[PDB]
Short mmCIF file of C-alpha atoms and ligand atoms in Angstrom, two decimals:
data_model
loop_
_atom_site.label_atom_id
_atom_site.label_comp_id
_atom_site.label_asym_id
_atom_site.label_seq_id
_atom_site.Cartn_x
_atom_site.Cartn_y
_atom_site.Cartn_z
CA UNK A 15 0.00 0.00 0.00
CA UNK A 16 0.83 3.70 0.15
CA UNK A 17 1.07 6.23 2.96
CA UNK A 18 -2.01 8.07 1.70
CA UNK A 19 -3.96 4.82 1.79
CA UNK A 20 -2.93 3.98 5.36
CA UNK A 21 -3.86 7.52 6.40
CA UNK A 22 -7.24 7.32 4.65
CA UNK A 23 -7.93 4.09 6.54
CA UNK A 24 -7.04 5.61 9.93
CA UNK A 25 -8.75 8.96 9.14
CA UNK A 26 -12.21 7.87 7.94
CA UNK A 27 -14.48 5.35 9.55
CA UNK A 28 -14.40 1.83 8.05
CA UNK A 29 -17.85 2.18 6.54
CA UNK A 30 -16.97 5.34 4.59
CA UNK A 31 -13.78 3.67 3.36
CA UNK A 32 -15.76 0.66 2.13
CA UNK A 33 -18.22 2.90 0.27
CA UNK A 34 -15.38 4.87 -1.33
CA UNK A 35 -13.80 1.63 -2.52
CA UNK A 36 -17.07 0.38 -4.02
CA UNK A 37 -17.65 3.77 -5.66
CA UNK A 38 -14.17 3.78 -7.20
CA UNK A 39 -14.23 0.12 -8.24
CA UNK A 40 -17.61 0.71 -9.91
CA UNK A 41 -15.90 3.35 -12.08
CA UNK A 42 -12.82 1.24 -12.86
CA UNK A 43 -10.41 2.96 -10.46
CA UNK A 44 -8.26 1.39 -7.74
CA UNK A 45 -7.90 2.98 -4.28
CA UNK A 46 -4.52 1.30 -3.86
CA UNK A 47 -3.10 3.40 -6.72
CA UNK A 48 -5.48 6.38 -7.07
CA UNK A 49 -4.86 7.23 -3.43
CA UNK A 50 -5.45 10.99 -3.72
CA UNK A 51 -8.83 10.33 -5.33
CA UNK A 52 -9.42 7.74 -2.60
CA UNK A 53 -9.02 10.43 0.07
CA UNK A 54 -11.22 12.86 -1.91
CA UNK A 55 -14.02 10.32 -2.39
CA UNK A 56 -13.90 9.48 1.33
CA UNK A 57 -13.96 13.18 2.19
CA UNK A 58 -16.88 13.87 -0.14
CA UNK A 59 -18.68 10.86 1.37
CA UNK A 60 -18.23 12.05 4.96
CA UNK A 61 -19.38 15.58 4.12
CA UNK A 62 -22.49 14.23 2.42
CA UNK A 63 -23.22 12.17 5.54
CA UNK A 64 -22.69 14.96 8.08
CA UNK A 65 -24.81 17.15 5.79
CA UNK A 66 -27.74 14.72 5.82
CA UNK A 67 -27.08 14.36 9.56
CA UNK A 68 -27.86 18.07 9.86
CA UNK A 69 -31.54 18.93 9.94
CA UNK A 70 -34.60 16.86 10.74
CA UNK A 71 -34.92 13.07 10.72
CA UNK A 72 -36.81 12.64 7.43
CA UNK A 73 -35.40 15.75 5.80
CA UNK A 74 -32.94 14.31 3.29
CA UNK A 75 -32.77 11.34 0.96
CA UNK A 76 -29.13 10.25 0.63
CA UNK A 77 -28.28 9.64 -3.03
CA UNK A 78 -24.50 9.50 -2.75
CA UNK A 79 -23.11 6.25 -1.40
CA UNK A 80 -25.40 4.00 -3.41
CA UNK A 81 -24.44 2.10 -6.53
CA UNK A 82 -25.14 4.04 -9.72
CA UNK A 83 -28.21 1.94 -10.61
CA UNK A 84 -29.91 2.16 -7.21
CA UNK A 85 -29.17 5.89 -6.88
CA UNK A 86 -30.92 6.55 -10.19
CA UNK A 87 -33.85 4.46 -9.01
CA UNK A 88 -34.33 6.56 -5.89
CA UNK A 89 -33.84 9.71 -8.00
CA UNK A 90 -36.52 8.45 -10.39
CA UNK A 91 -38.87 7.80 -7.46
CA UNK A 92 -38.29 11.29 -6.05
CA UNK A 93 -39.03 12.92 -9.40
CA UNK A 94 -42.13 10.81 -9.97
CA UNK A 95 -43.30 11.63 -6.44
CA UNK A 96 -42.65 15.37 -6.21
CA UNK A 97 -42.66 16.35 -9.89
CA UNK A 98 -39.15 17.82 -9.79
CA UNK A 99 -37.39 17.55 -13.15
CA UNK A 100 -35.00 14.59 -13.47
CA UNK A 101 -31.43 15.94 -13.20
CA UNK A 102 -28.92 15.23 -15.95
CA UNK A 103 -26.20 14.20 -13.48
CA UNK A 104 -26.60 12.12 -10.33
CA UNK A 105 -26.87 14.49 -7.34
CA UNK A 106 -25.85 13.86 -3.72
CA UNK A 107 -29.03 14.46 -1.73
CA UNK A 108 -32.65 15.43 -2.03
CA UNK A 109 -34.20 17.97 0.36
CA UNK A 110 -37.73 16.90 1.21
CA UNK A 111 -38.14 20.18 3.09
CA UNK A 112 -37.01 22.43 0.22
CA UNK A 113 -38.13 20.04 -2.58
CA UNK A 114 -34.82 20.26 -4.45
CA UNK A 115 -31.86 18.04 -5.22
CA UNK A 116 -28.52 19.02 -3.69
CA UNK A 117 -25.05 18.67 -5.21
CA UNK A 118 -22.33 18.73 -2.55
CA UNK A 119 -18.84 19.82 -3.58
CA UNK A 120 -15.56 19.67 -1.68
CA UNK A 121 -12.66 21.63 -3.15
CA UNK A 122 -9.00 22.37 -2.57
CA UNK A 123 -9.26 25.59 -4.64
CA UNK A 124 -11.42 28.68 -4.23
CA UNK A 125 -15.08 27.78 -3.73
CA UNK A 126 -15.66 30.38 -6.45
CA UNK A 127 -13.90 28.29 -9.11
CA UNK A 128 -15.59 25.00 -8.13
CA UNK A 129 -19.15 26.34 -8.01
CA UNK A 130 -18.75 27.79 -11.50
CA UNK A 131 -17.50 24.41 -12.68
CA UNK A 132 -20.54 22.70 -11.12
CA UNK A 133 -23.21 25.24 -12.09
CA UNK A 134 -21.94 25.07 -15.67
CA UNK A 135 -22.25 21.28 -15.75
CA UNK A 136 -25.65 21.08 -14.03
CA UNK A 137 -27.50 23.69 -16.15
CA UNK A 138 -30.67 22.28 -14.51
CA UNK A 139 -31.07 25.33 -12.26
CA UNK A 140 -33.46 23.37 -10.01
CA UNK A 141 -30.58 21.40 -8.48
CA UNK A 142 -29.14 23.24 -5.48
CA UNK A 143 -25.33 23.47 -5.24
CA UNK A 144 -23.43 23.73 -1.94
CA UNK A 145 -19.62 23.93 -2.03
CA UNK A 146 -17.28 23.47 0.93
CA UNK A 147 -13.54 24.14 0.88
CA UNK A 148 -10.66 22.75 2.94
CA UNK A 149 -9.94 26.31 4.12
CA UNK A 150 -13.38 26.79 5.70
CA UNK A 151 -15.17 28.74 3.00
CA UNK A 152 -18.59 27.75 1.72
CA UNK A 153 -20.85 28.83 -1.12
CA UNK A 154 -24.43 27.81 -1.90
CA UNK A 155 -27.03 28.59 -4.54
CA UNK A 156 -29.05 31.74 -3.74
CA UNK A 157 -26.89 32.01 -0.60
CA UNK A 158 -29.42 29.46 0.70
CA UNK A 159 -27.17 27.30 2.86
CA UNK A 160 -29.99 24.85 3.67
CA UNK A 161 -28.66 23.84 7.10
CA UNK A 162 -28.05 25.88 10.23
CA UNK A 163 -24.67 27.50 10.79
CA UNK A 164 -23.71 24.96 13.48
CA UNK A 165 -24.09 21.95 11.15
CA UNK A 166 -22.08 23.69 8.45
CA UNK A 167 -19.41 24.79 10.94
CA UNK A 168 -18.88 21.15 11.97
CA UNK A 169 -18.31 20.22 8.32
CA UNK A 170 -15.86 23.10 7.89
CA UNK A 171 -14.01 22.10 11.08
CA UNK A 172 -13.74 18.46 10.01
CA UNK A 173 -12.40 19.51 6.60
CA UNK A 174 -9.64 21.59 8.17
CA UNK A 175 -8.75 18.70 10.48
CA UNK A 176 -8.30 16.42 7.46
CA UNK A 177 -6.14 19.13 5.88
CA UNK A 178 -3.91 19.31 8.96
CA UNK A 179 -3.48 15.54 9.27
CA UNK A 180 -2.55 15.20 5.59
CA UNK A 181 -0.01 18.01 5.98
CA UNK A 182 1.46 16.43 9.11
CA UNK A 183 2.18 13.41 6.89
CA UNK A 184 3.43 15.63 4.01
CA UNK A 185 0.52 14.34 1.91
CA UNK A 186 -1.44 17.58 1.67
CA UNK A 187 0.61 19.18 -1.09
CA UNK A 188 0.25 16.15 -3.35
CA UNK A 189 -3.46 16.01 -2.45
CA UNK A 190 -3.95 19.72 -3.21
CA UNK A 191 -2.00 19.72 -6.49
CA UNK A 192 -4.16 16.83 -7.70
CA UNK A 193 -7.73 18.09 -8.03
C1 LIG B 5 -28.69 3.24 5.47
C2 LIG B 5 -27.36 2.47 5.46
C3 LIG B 5 -26.14 3.39 5.65
C4 LIG B 5 -26.37 4.86 5.26
C5 LIG B 5 -25.20 5.73 5.72
C6 LIG B 5 -25.49 6.73 6.86
C7 LIG B 5 -24.30 6.66 7.83
C8 LIG B 5 -24.46 7.57 9.05
C9 LIG B 5 -24.63 6.70 10.30
C10 LIG B 5 -24.93 7.55 11.54
C11 LIG B 5 -26.11 6.93 12.29
N1 LIG B 5 -23.77 7.66 12.42
C12 LIG B 5 -23.47 8.84 13.23
C13 LIG B 5 -22.52 8.36 14.32
C14 LIG B 5 -21.72 7.26 13.67
C15 LIG B 5 -22.71 6.66 12.66
O1 LIG B 5 -22.61 5.58 12.18
N2 LIG B 5 -23.30 8.43 9.24
C16 LIG B 5 -23.35 9.89 9.33
C17 LIG B 5 -22.01 10.33 9.92
C18 LIG B 5 -21.03 9.22 9.55
C19 LIG B 5 -21.91 7.99 9.36
O2 LIG B 5 -21.52 6.87 9.34
N3 LIG B 5 -26.75 6.50 7.54
C20 LIG B 5 -27.94 7.37 7.47
C21 LIG B 5 -29.12 6.49 7.91
C22 LIG B 5 -28.51 5.56 8.92
C23 LIG B 5 -27.08 5.37 8.43
O3 LIG B 5 -26.36 4.48 8.72
N4 LIG B 5 -26.38 4.94 3.82
C24 LIG B 5 -25.33 4.40 2.91
C25 LIG B 5 -25.58 5.09 1.57
C26 LIG B 5 -27.04 5.42 1.56
C27 LIG B 5 -27.42 5.56 3.00
O4 LIG B 5 -28.40 6.09 3.42
N5 LIG B 5 -27.27 1.65 4.25
C28 LIG B 5 -28.28 1.57 3.19
C29 LIG B 5 -28.01 0.26 2.45
C30 LIG B 5 -26.51 0.09 2.56
C31 LIG B 5 -26.17 0.75 3.90
O5 LIG B 5 -25.20 0.57 4.53
C1 LIG B 6 -16.47 10.49 -12.30
O1 LIG B 6 -16.01 10.77 -11.01
C2 LIG B 6 -16.09 9.71 -10.10
C3 LIG B 6 -17.14 9.64 -9.19
C4 LIG B 6 -17.21 8.59 -8.28
C5 LIG B 6 -18.37 8.51 -7.29
C6 LIG B 6 -18.76 9.89 -6.76
N1 LIG B 6 -19.90 10.37 -7.51
C7 LIG B 6 -20.15 11.77 -7.79
O2 LIG B 6 -21.12 12.05 -8.42
C8 LIG B 6 -19.21 12.89 -7.33
N2 LIG B 6 -17.79 12.79 -7.60
C9 LIG B 6 -16.89 13.87 -7.14
C10 LIG B 6 -15.41 13.76 -7.42
C11 LIG B 6 -14.95 14.02 -8.70
F1 LIG B 6 -15.84 14.36 -9.68
C12 LIG B 6 -13.59 13.92 -8.95
C13 LIG B 6 -12.72 13.57 -7.93
C14 LIG B 6 -13.19 13.31 -6.65
C15 LIG B 6 -14.55 13.41 -6.39
F2 LIG B 6 -15.07 13.17 -5.15
N3 LIG B 6 -17.38 15.06 -6.43
C16 LIG B 6 -18.79 15.17 -6.16
O3 LIG B 6 -19.19 16.12 -5.59
C17 LIG B 6 -19.72 14.09 -6.61
O4 LIG B 6 -21.08 14.21 -6.34
C18 LIG B 6 -16.23 7.61 -8.28
C19 LIG B 6 -15.18 7.68 -9.17
C20 LIG B 6 -15.11 8.72 -10.08
O5 LIG B 6 -14.04 8.79 -10.99
MN1 LIG B 7 -22.18 12.65 -6.09
MN1 LIG B 8 -20.99 15.94 -4.91
#
């Protein structure tokens, strides 16, 4: 293995690691070699899960972390239930409270650059976008940040902790200059 891979395994809970492996293997990639993308997928997974963990019990439907086929099935059910237009690209969550799909982004650059890259791909303006950065910035469609400040602050804190641990192992630079 690699040092990034050992760190990923001691940084994220086993269940998130397993989901990141399945997600990568489903798209033909190997966590043992694509170790920077392994850490990113794990990170994006954890953020998605803390995000859904913010708010009420039945508020979100978690799309990320399922296999492509099942995720599109739930997405289909949500659209055929609420009437929301079917997104072109698989989103990360659905907000039953706001009746909109959510795309969660985690970036090592300026949240400004990432959101533009996502909003340009989505085009379907119905899908909400919420970007977090490893420096603690955030940016969301309509400045509607969906969750309370405390739930978002926990996500920002966790992201900076992952940044510090990677740097302590001299892995952060390679992780940053890889997105
Ligand atoms: C439903 C189930 C798994 C869920 C994943 C997600 C994990 C959640 C667990 C919570 C509780 N906490 C908090 C304390 C530690 C812990 O464990 N969090 C959030 C923080 C980290 C974490 O782990 N949730 C939410 C519902 C219960 C649950 O476990 N998933 C996986 C993808 C889709 C989905 O909804 N499924 C579904 C079938 C396969 C499987 O595993
Ligand atoms: C094609 O990309 C891949 C996607 C996956 C499963 C994750 N599914 C997503 O839809 C997704 N992916 C990413 C993302 C990325 F686009 C590049 C690098 C790291 C990432 F986390 N960010 C998101 O916010 C998001 O929702 C597995 C393997 C892939 O190669
Ligand atoms: Mn996704
Ligand atoms: Mn996402």
